[PDB]
């Protein structure tokens, strides 16, 4: 149950049930710049874990710019509802 199989509500899914089941985990990129607020939810596959040990993409040392609060979790459908504003 869950953990290895995550249905992460994703942005590009559309007819993919609005969510895609991953082999890795859930991942939302919330990057609110002065460009726009770029919040995109994706099902992060295990292959998409970069690096595979721990996707640093979920913790790129967001210091002040970009406001990139990356959601990564192993709960089902926890995608855009993980840690509240964690850089």
From Swiss-Prot:
Localization per record: Cell membrane; Cell junction, Tight junction; Cell surface; Membrane raft
Glycosylation site residues: 17
Summary of the tissues where the protein is detected: Found in all tissues examined, most abundant in placenta and least abundant in brain and heart. Expressed in a variety of cancer cell lines.
Disulfide links within the chain: 8-26, 10-13, 20-43, 58-72, 73-78
Post-translational modification summary for this protein: Phosphorylated at basal levels in the absence of ligand. Activated upon phosphorylation by TGFBR2, mainly in the GS domain. Phosphorylation in the GS domain abrogates FKBP1A-binding.
Extracellular side: 6-87
Illness: Loeys-Dietz syndrome 1: An aortic aneurysm syndrome with widespread systemic involvement, characterized by arterial tortuosity and aneurysms, hypertelorism, and bifid uvula or cleft palate. Physical findings include prominent joint laxity, easy bruising, wide and atrophic scars, velvety and translucent skin with easily visible veins, spontaneous rupture of the spleen or bowel, and catastrophic complications of pregnancy, including rupture of the gravid uterus and the arteries, either during pregnancy or in the immediate postpartum period.
Subunit structure, interactors included: Homodimer; in the endoplasmic reticulum but also at the cell membrane. Heterohexamer; TGFB1, TGFB2 and TGFB3 homodimeric ligands assemble a functional receptor composed of two TGFBR1 and TGFBR2 heterodimers to form a ligand-receptor heterohexamer. The respective affinity of TGBRB1 and TGFBR2 for the ligands may modulate the kinetics of assembly of the receptor and may explain the different biological activities of TGFB1, TGFB2 and TGFB3.
Family: Belongs to the protein kinase superfamily. TKL Ser/Thr protein kinase family. TGFB receptor subfamily.
Role of this protein: Transmembrane serine/threonine kinase forming with the TGF-beta type II serine/threonine kinase receptor, TGFBR2, the non-promiscuous receptor for the TGF-beta cytokines TGFB1, TGFB2 and TGFB3. Transduces the TGFB1, TGFB2 and TGFB3 signal from the cell surface to the cytoplasm and is thus regulating a plethora of physiological and pathological processes including cell cycle arrest in epithelial and hematopoietic cells, control of mesenchymal cell proliferation and differentiation, wound healing, extracellular matrix production, immunosuppression and carcinogenesis.
Protein name: TGF-beta receptor type-1
Underlying gene: TGFBR1
Location of this fragment in the whole protein: 31 to 115 of 503
């Amino acid at each position: 149950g869950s953990a290895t199989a995550l249905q992460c509500f994703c942005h590009l899914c559309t007819k993919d049930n609005f969510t895609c089941v991953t082999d890795g985990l859930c991942f939302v990129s919330v990057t609110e710049t002065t460009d726009k607020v770029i919040h995109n939810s994706m099902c992060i596959a295990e292959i998409d874990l970069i690096p595979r040990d721990r996707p640093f993409v979920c913790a790129p040392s967001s210091k002040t710019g970009s406001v990139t609060t990356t959601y990564c979790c192993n709960q089902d459908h926890c995608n855009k509802i993980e840690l509240p504003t964690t850089v």
